[PDB]
Amino acid sequence: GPMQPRLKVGAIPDQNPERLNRLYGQLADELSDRLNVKVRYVPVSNYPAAVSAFRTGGLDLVWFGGLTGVQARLQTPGAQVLAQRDIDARFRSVFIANTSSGLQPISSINGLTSLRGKRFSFGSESSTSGRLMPQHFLAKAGVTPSQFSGGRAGFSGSHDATIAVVQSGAYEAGALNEQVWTSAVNDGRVNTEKVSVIWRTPEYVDYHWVVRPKLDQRFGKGFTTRLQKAILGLEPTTPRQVTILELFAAKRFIPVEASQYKPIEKVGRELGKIR
Ligand SMILES: [Cl-]
Ligand SMILES: [Cl-]
Ligand SMILES: [Cl-]
Ligand SMILES: [Cl-]
Ligand SMILES: [Cl-]
Ligand SMILES: [Cl-]
Ligand SMILES: [Cl-]
Ligand SMILES: [Cl-]
Ligand SMILES: [Cl-]
Ligand SMILES: [Cl-]
């Protein structure tokens, strides 16, 4: 570059953009200070745009879901996974229902048959915790979205929006990210008189950082390792890092296990979401 290099950081748009701008904008400044390079957060409008901008070089480092990060790595030779939160090793979805819907707590996966004929919303089409794994667990109970009221599921686009369309009564039930649910309950952003959890899924792996190949050619030998150490180094010490980690709802970032994403890829191929 005739210019000094700049690291472009992105994230799937999985909740309110104003909240994500506070998190990733502060994280860009924190990485900038830790690395002594220019770092900018570049937002995207939907989940596929995160995959595509990563693939084409519009984003260098992205906070992906399970499904989107698998897609981004399959489409981008030499992309690496760098880290995940502590909680991403053992992630869950919550199935929620409007408390007027008559839907009862479910004690087994077989109980998901109760959602046949109901208005049900997934999150993003490409969401792991809001679509893929929920659709997987539904299919094991013998429920397909064809069986919901209207012959299909809603897609709200985000974990926040799934809470909002169940809370409003526009849908009777939905599925979303358990961390976003728990944070919204704790923060007062969900009316727990109107919405309750009917089921928590089995554990699966979900969010992780994926980095583009060849960043060492742009920023110098060792940079990608320094970037991975910067993420794994995040600690609740300064106000800035306390805020970053509270918005992630993590105590720390941890390394991933080699091919811990093979079960998410397998589900993605089973449900036709991976080419
Ligand atoms: Cl920049
Ligand atoms: Cl740039
Ligand atoms: Cl990945
Ligand atoms: Cl793909
Ligand atoms: Cl779809
Ligand atoms: Cl279907
Ligand atoms: Cl559908
Ligand atoms: Cl519908
Ligand atoms: Cl390189
Ligand atoms: Cl560091």
Residue numbers in the entry: -2 to 272
Excerpt from the paper describing this PDB structure:
Picocyanobacteria strains encode a putative ABC-type phosphite/phosphate/phosphonate transporter, phnDCE, thought to provide access to an alternative phosphorus pool. To understand the function of the PhnDCE transport system and its ecological consequences, we characterised the PhnD1 binding proteins from four distinct marine Synechococcus isolates (CC9311, CC9605, MITS9220, and WH8102). We show the Synechococcus PhnD1 proteins selectively bind phosphorus compounds with a stronger affinity for phosphite than for phosphate or methyl phosphonate. However, based on our comprehensive ligand screening and growth experiments showing Synechococcus strains WH8102 and MITS9220 cannot utilise phosphite or methylphosphonate as a sole phosphorus source, we hypothesise that the picocyanobacterial PhnDCE transporter is a constitutively expressed, medium-affinity phosphate transporter, and the measured affinity of PhnD1 to phosphite or methyl phosphonate is fortuitous.
Therefore, to understand the molecular mechanism of Pi selectivity, we determined a high-resolution crystal structure (2.0 Å) of Synechococcus MITS9220_PhnD1 with bound Pi, resulting in a closed ligand-bound complex. The overall structure of MITS9220_PhnD1 is similar to that of other class II substrate binding proteins (SBPs) and specifically to cluster-F SBPs, with two α/β domains separated by a longer central hinge region (8–10 amino acids). The extended hinge region in cluster-F SBPs is believed to provide greater flexibility between the ligand-bound (closed) and unbound (open) conformations of cluster-F SBPs. This hinge region encompasses a buried ligand-binding cavity and includes a Pi molecule within the MITS9220_PhnD1 structure copurified with the protein. The MITS9220_PhnD1 structure displays an unusual asymmetric distribution of electrostatic surface potential, where the front is completely enveloped by positive charge, attracting several Cl- anions from the crystallisation buffer. Within the crystal structure of MITS9220_PhnD1, the four Pi oxygens are bound by a total of 10 direct hydrogen bonds, forming an extensive H-bond network to the main chain and sidechains of residues distributed between the two domains. These include a tyrosine (Y44) at the beginning of α2; an -STS- motif (S124, T125, S126) in a loop region joining β6 and α4; a histidine (H156) at the beginning of α6; an H-acceptor aspartic acid (D203) and a capping tyrosine residue (Y204) found just before β10. A single water molecule buried deep within the cavity also contributes to this hydrogen bond network. This water molecule is further stabilised by intramolecular hydrogen bonds to residues on domain 1 (T65) and domain 2 (S123), contributing to the interactions that connect the two domains and occluding the binding pocket from the solvent. Similarly, the capping Y204 sidechain is engaged in hydrogen bonds to residues D11 (domain 1) and N174 (domain 2), contributing to the two-domain interactions.
